[PDB]
């Protein structure tokens, strides 16, 4: 959740609620899918150590974070560009993302 329409340059915070599992046994990662169906890696956080990594695409604008206690993954998008329009997923990461997000469409216009 946290999606919706936003005007270019705006900011937004995406959430992701995990359940079933031991939250901190697994890394959560933010991946988007653009309207033309292309998939892109947005960011990677290790929820137990705080450590975040990103492609240049969003470097310095998006900020991934988590709460091992409340079982929450966050994406804080800042200075949104038109190209960030897309569906955003997270996904519980051991050697892959085997579950688990249903999406959440952000639209920058």
């Amino acid at each position: 959740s946290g999606a919706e329409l936003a005007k270019p340059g705006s900011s937004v915070k995406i959430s992701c609620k995990a359940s079933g599992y031991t939250f901190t046994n697994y890394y959560i990662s933010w991946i988007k899918q653009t309207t033309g169906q292309g998939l892109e890696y947005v960011g990677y956080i290790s929820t137990g150590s705080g450590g975040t990594n990103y492609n240049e695409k969003f470097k310095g604008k998006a900020t991934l974070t988590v709460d091992k206690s409340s079982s929450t993954t966050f994406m804080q998008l800042s200075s949104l560009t038109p190209d960030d329009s897309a569906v955003y997923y997270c996904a519980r990461g051991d050697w892959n993302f085997d579950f688990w997000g249903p999406g959440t469409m952000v639209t920058v216009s």
């Binding site: 998939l39 990677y44 997923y89 050697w95 892959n96 249903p102």
Partner: protein, 107 residues
């Protein structure tokens, strides 16, 4: 990064199909394959090149060496339509292939 060929793949039910990806460094078998059925989120099929994650039927198999990995469906069934994506985890950040849409050839 990754390159996926072919882009479109018309196949008849019962047919076999092969979708391949190629990386820029040797990625040591750490690649996975996702199926995004239409109108749904993607789902995992094979991880570590060929290890079938549970629930996936054995008509799907993975293989590959150095930089080229292939997904094979021995007998294509109706439920297998949608877009397949390969993805490497050899080095962050995780990068996905552009996708191969499988369409069912029908009468």
């Amino acid at each position: 990064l990754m390159t996926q060929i072919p882009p479109s793949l018309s196949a008849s039910l019962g047919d076999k199909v092969t979708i391949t990806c190629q990386a820029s460094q040797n990625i040591n078998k750490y690649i996975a394959w996702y199926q995004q059925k239409p109108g749904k989120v993607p789902g995992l099929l094979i991880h570590y090149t060929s290890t079938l994650v549970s629930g996936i039927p054995s008509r799907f198999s993975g293989s590959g060496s150095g930089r080229d990995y292939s997904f094979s469906i021995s007998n294509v069934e109706s439920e297998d339509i949608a877009s397949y994506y390969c993805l490497q985890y050899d080095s962050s950040p995780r990068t996905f292939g552009g996708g191969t849409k499988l369409e069912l050839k029908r009468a």
